[PDB]
Each structure stands twice: as C-alpha cells, then as structure tokens.
Design a protein around this ligand. Structure first.
Ligand SMILES: Nc1nc2ccccc2[nH]1
Ligand SMILES: [Ca+2]
Length: 223
C-alpha cells in the first residue's frame, strides 16, 4: 500500500496473509472455512495466516491453517486478468472472535464515489521496494467507469473497477494482490492489477465481487 497508514493491530479482522515461507498475497475471510483471493495468487503449498498484524513476529492472535483446496475461477484469463478471483478452503475452520472475523459479501454493486478501505502488506514505495512488517490501510473511492476506461482503454471488462486517486501518491501495489476492498461493510473488490503503483492517472484495478456472489455461493455449497 503506497501513501496509506498503519491500520492498528487487528482492526481489519477479515484480512489474511497467504504464506509459502514468505507473504505473497492477501485475501479475505468470508466464513470460518473459506477465503476469497485473486486467481493470480494461485500456487500449491499455501498456508493461510489469520489474525496477523506484524507478519514477521508471532504476537498472539495468529491462526496458521493450511489450505485444503484452491479453486481458481474456470474462466480466469491470465493475459487479461478477467475473472481474477479464487476461493481457498481451509483444512479446518478458523475460530472467529473480535480479532478474526469474516466480512460480508455484497447484495448490490457499489457506485462511483463510494469510499472503501483497502489493506495489505504489499510494497509501500512506487519507485522501489519496501515491504512493511505490519498491516497498512488506505481509504480510496471507486472511480466512474468512464475515468477507469479512459485510464486503461481496451483493458477494463465488466468484472473490474478502478479505485484510487488520479493525482497518484496513494494506491495498492505488489504484495497487496488478492486482498480486500471493503465499502460500507461489504467486500466489493479484490486487489488485482494496475500500471505501476501510485502513478498519476493509473489507478488500481479491482475484481468486481458483486458479479460473483452467486458463483461463490454455488461453489462453496458444492465443495
Ligand atoms: N495499483 C496496483 N495494484 C497492484 C496490484 C498488484 C501489482 C501492481 C499493482 N498496482
Ligand atoms: Ca505476527
């Protein structure tokens, strides 16, 4: 997260860290046994880490659970990143409390102008790499489809939306991939892609979760 602030320990209880010997992507807990992340974060050997703040120190509240299966959307296109969403089933259920909790899926999509909270342990520098130890937060608005399409002509599908600042300076970045974009208490986006991080007129692009709720429900119901 570039231009964000320190969230504060366990203030984002649905945030998870996907770990394979190091943190490589974020995700959101949507129930005690399932996590939603981005398809491009797929790999085998994933350990899901819940209740984290400093990812390099066991401070208490952490729950490390192995993933039993990862289900990448069948229509995910790695060249266009269309349908960039994945569900991860945990080997055992997580214990939910105030520090570890799930986030609700939306019932309707959000409108441009909606202010959302984006969080993660990704890079904090636009020109260079500095990975933080603790969780960073950024409040950002959803942009209109015209501004998004004008920023990324020919690359935005109906399953994506832009959020951020056109002046640059604040944005998600590598390492934040798969993490949450929450607006009014509902998970509306998943950190997917962008051109660089925090560059002027190149806002971040997110997977539009409201378009996948029935898919998520049906898939969880059958697995
Ligand atoms: N804004 C933005 N978000 C990103 C997520 C992964 C890689 C680069 C990115 N740029
Ligand atoms: Ca920790």
């Amino acid at each position: 997260i570039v231009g964000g602030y320190t969230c504060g320990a366990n203030t984002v209880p649905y945030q998870v860290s996907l770990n394979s010997g190091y943190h490589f992507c974020g995700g959101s807990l949507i129930n005690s046994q399932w996590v939603v992340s981005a398809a491009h974060c797929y790999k085998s050997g994933i350990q899901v880490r819940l209740g984290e703040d400093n990812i390099n120190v066991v401070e208490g509240n952490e729950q490390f659970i192995s993933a039993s299966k990862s289900i990448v959307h069948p229509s995910y296109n790695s060249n266009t990143l269309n349908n960039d969403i994945m569900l991860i089933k945990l080997k055992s259920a997580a214990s939910l409390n105030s520090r570890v909790a799930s986030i609700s899926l939306p019932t309707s999509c959000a409108s441009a102008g909606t202010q959302c909270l984006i969080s993660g342990w990704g890079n904090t520098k636009s020109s260079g790499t500095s990975y933080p130890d603790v969780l960073k937060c950024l409040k950002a608005p959803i942009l209109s489809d015209s501004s998004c399409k004008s920023a990324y002509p020919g690359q935005i599908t109906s399953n994506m939306f832009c959020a951020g600042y056109l002046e640059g300076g604040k944005d998600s970045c590598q390492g934040d991939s798969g993490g949450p974009v929450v607006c009014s208490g509902k998970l509306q986006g998943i950190v997917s892609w962008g051109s660089g991080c925090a560059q002027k007129n190149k806002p971040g692009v997110y997977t539009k979760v409201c378009n996948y709720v029935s898919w998520i429900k049906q898939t969880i119901a059958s697995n």
